[PDB]
Amino acid sequence: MNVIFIMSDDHTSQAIGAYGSHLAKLNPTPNIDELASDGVVFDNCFCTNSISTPSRACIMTGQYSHHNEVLTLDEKLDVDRQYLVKEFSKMGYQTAMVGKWHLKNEPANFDYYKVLNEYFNPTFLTNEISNKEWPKNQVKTNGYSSDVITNITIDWLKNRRDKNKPFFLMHHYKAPHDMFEYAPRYKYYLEDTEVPVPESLYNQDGWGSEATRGKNDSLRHFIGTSISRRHENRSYAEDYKINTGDPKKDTYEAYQRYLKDYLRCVKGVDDNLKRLFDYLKKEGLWENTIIVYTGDQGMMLGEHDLQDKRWMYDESMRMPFIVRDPKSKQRGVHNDLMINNIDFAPTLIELAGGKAPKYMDGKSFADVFEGKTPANWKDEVYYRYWMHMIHHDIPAHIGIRTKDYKLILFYGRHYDEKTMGTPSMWWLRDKGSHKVVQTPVAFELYDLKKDPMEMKNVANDPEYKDVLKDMKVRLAKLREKVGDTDEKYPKIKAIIDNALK
Ligand SMILES: [Ca+2]
Ligand code: NI
Ligand code: NI
C-alpha cells in the first residue's frame, strides 16, 4: 500500500478535536477528526526530545538523538542517515518529500523533493529543476504556504507519480509554527469567540520545583518564557505590547491573541486536508493508502503560563498521532499503547510489507492494526531535552514517563562547554539576555492518574517516597539501556549519576 505521512510543525494535541481537550468544543480540526473517525488515535504517543529538528531526525532515523546525533536545533541530519526513505526505496517505492524540511541537508534520498529549506509566496528547493543542484535549485510560488504545499503534493500525485509503483510521500506543513502568520481569509475566524482558558494559566501553586522556579521562587522571572510578563525577557504579553493597566488582563488578552492566531493557522491546514483527502478519494487512492497525521511535537498553549515546546510536560512531550490503515479493522478507535516518534519508521516499514530494521532504536507497533498488543512492548518512555536555556530559557532535563507517573530530572547544564556562559537569546545580546548558566538540579514527579494536568509536583511528598525511589531506578536503568550515559560530557554525567544515587 502507499503511504502518506502528513506532519504539521508544532501542531499540538490540545488543538485537535479528536483528543478531547478544553479546546475541542471549538471544533478546531473537523477534517482531521473525520480522518480520526476512520482510523486510530494514539493517546500516548511521545517525542523523545521536543524540538523540530531532533524530533524529525528521530522520525527519519528510528533512533534516539544521542545515536542520530541531532541533539538540538543547531545540528544537521547526515544524508546517509535518511533511513526511513532509504528503506522505502529499497522496497521499490517511489519516494517524495514535499513542504517544510528541517533536516538541513539535501533530501537526496528522495526521488522527488520540493521543500522549504516563507508563509506568503514561498520559495522552494526542488529537484524538478534540471540545470541546478541543491541548494540553488529554487522555484518561486504565489500564495499562502499551506495552500501551495497542498497543491504541490496533489500536482505530484496527479502528474508526476508513476501510477504502477507504490509511493511513500512525506507531506510537511510549515503551519502552525511561529509566528502564526495565518492566511488573511481567517482573520475573523474566532474573532467573537472566547478561547477557553486553562486554570493553570494563572494558578501554578504546586507546579514545578527549585529546578524550574528557583529557591523561594527566585528564578520565576528567569526560567521558562511566559504568556504573562512573568518572564523578564520574553513573553507574549510584551511581544504583543499589551498594556491595559491590569497584569492579569494583560495575560488574558495575550493568551487569547496567541490562541486565536495559532488556531487560525491550524484551520488553514485542516481546510487544505479536505482538498487533499477529496483528491485521494477521487483518484482512487483512499482505499490503498495508509495516511498518518502527526505533529512533530506538542506545544505549551499557556498551560502553567508557559509557551513553546522543549519541556517534558505532557502538552509539549505528547505528539498527536492518527493513522488510517484501510486494510485494518481498527477504525474510529483510540489506542493507549506507549509509543515514540522513534517507533514510526519501523512500524511504517512493516505496515508497508517490510521488516523492522534492526539498526533502529524504535520497534514496530504494526500489530496494533490487527487488534493485538505488540509482543514485549515497553511500558515506559525515555525523554531528554539537551538545548539548555537557549531561546526560551528552559533548563536541560531527562525523564521517564509511564502510564501512571512522570519523573523529570532537571540537570541544568548545556552539553557544550563553549556554550555555557553565552547569551541565551542572541537578539538580546548586550540588552540583558540571560546567560547559559547552571540552573538548580531537582526532580519533579507527577501522579498522572490523579493529576493529568501536572499541577502538583509530588516528588517531596512523603506519601510518594516509594514511587519516587522506584521511578529513579527505572530512569537510571532505561538511560543505561538506551546508551545515553554521557561519557562525552563529564560534568553532566556527574550531576545525573549523583542525582539518581
Ligand atoms: Ca516543530
Ligand atoms: Ni523535516
Ligand atoms: Ni504551511
Side-chain angles (χ1 to χ4, degrees), residues 327-342:
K327 293 319 156 213
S328 168
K329 290 304 210 299
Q330 308 298 308
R331 314 280 282 273
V333 307
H334 288 239
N335 187 285
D336 75 349
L337 193 76
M338 299 277 294
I339 64 175
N340 286 125
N341 54 356
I342 56 158

Side-chain angles (χ1 to χ4, degrees), residues 126-132 134-139:
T126 171
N127 67 346
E128 71 197 10
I129 294 315
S130 189
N131 55 357
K132 301 236 181 66
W134 179 279
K136 305 164 66 170
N137 47 350
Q138 76 174 54
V139 162

Side-chain angles (χ1 to χ4, degrees), residues 254-281 283-354 356-371 373-382:
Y255 175 86
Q256 292 292 317
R257 160 115 195 251
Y258 171 33
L259 266 286
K260 286 182 194 181
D261 287 353
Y262 179 81
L263 291 171
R264 287 161 186 143
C265 298
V266 164
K267 178 70 170 190
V269 168
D270 192 79
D271 280 348
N272 269 285
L273 290 179
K274 171 65 167 156
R275 302 201 292 122
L276 173 63
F277 292 166
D278 276 359
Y279 164 82
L280 299 175
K281 286 164 186 168
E283 192 77 299
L285 292 166
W286 194 249
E287 299 302 332
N288 65 3
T289 302
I290 299 164
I291 297 179
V292 178
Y293 186 84
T294 190
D296 51 357
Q297 7 69 19
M299 183 107 97
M300 306 304 301
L301 298 178
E303 296 89 356
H304 316 299
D305 189 31
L306 302 164
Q307 55 164 114
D308 206 71
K309 50 272 190 185
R310 302 155 191 263
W311 293 109
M312 194 189 171
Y313 303 123
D314 249 3
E315 285 87 355
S316 164
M317 185 190 181
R318 168 174 278 111
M319 309 164 61
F321 186 71
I322 299 167
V323 177
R324 175 179 178 272
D325 169 2
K327 293 319 156 213
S328 168
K329 290 304 210 299
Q330 308 298 308
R331 314 280 282 273
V333 307
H334 288 239
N335 187 285
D336 75 349
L337 193 76
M338 299 277 294
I339 64 175
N340 286 125
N341 54 356
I342 56 158
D343 300 312
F344 293 2
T347 299
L348 292 175
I349 292 159
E350 286 205 339
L351 280 173
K358 268 46 197 165
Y359 57 84
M360 289 176 176
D361 294 320
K363 290 171 171 191
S364 173
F365 55 92
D367 282 1
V368 159
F369 299 92
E370 291 159 359
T373 295
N376 302 310
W377 196 258
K378 60 191 166 197
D379 61 359
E380 63 204 17
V381 293
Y382 183 65

Side-chain angles (χ1 to χ4, degrees), residues 83-112:
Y83 296 143
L84 173 59
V85 55
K86 284 180 143 302
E87 293 280 343
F88 269 85
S89 193
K90 188 214 301 184
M91 297 184 291
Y93 282 65
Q94 67 198 305
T95 57
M97 172 66 235
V98 167
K100 180 59 180 177
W101 174 254
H102 274 275
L103 298 176
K104 293 172 183 184
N105 286 315
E106 180 186 13
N109 284 113
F110 283 91
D111 295 321
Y112 172 94

Side-chain angles (χ1 to χ4, degrees), residues 90 95 125 146 150 154 163 330 344 396 434 449 451 475:
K90 188 214 301 184
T95 57
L125 300 184
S146 300
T150 305
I154 292 174
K163 297 196 197 288
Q330 308 298 308
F344 293 2
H434 299 145
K449 293 301 172 184
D451 177 33
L475 176 54

Side-chain angles (χ1 to χ4, degrees), residues 9-10 51-52 56 102 177 296-297 309:
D9 194 341
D10 289 356
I51 11 178
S52 306
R56 285 150 192 261
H102 274 275
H177 186 279
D296 51 357
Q297 7 69 19
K309 50 272 190 185

Side-chain angles (χ1 to χ4, degrees), residues 201 204 220-240 251 254-255 258 300-308 311 391-394 425:
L201 175 60
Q204 296 93 47
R220 292 205 70 197
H221 63 279
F222 188 88
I223 287 158
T225 56
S226 51
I227 310 303
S228 78
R229 283 196 174 79
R230 171 183 57 77
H231 190 276
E232 84 182 306
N233 283 337
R234 183 177 191 176
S235 74
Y236 276 113
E238 178 66 28
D239 281 350
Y240 293 141
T251 301
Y255 175 86
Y258 171 33
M300 306 304 301
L301 298 178
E303 296 89 356
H304 316 299
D305 189 31
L306 302 164
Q307 55 164 114
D308 206 71
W311 293 109
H391 300 140
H392 285 274
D393 288 352
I394 299 171
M425 301 175 179

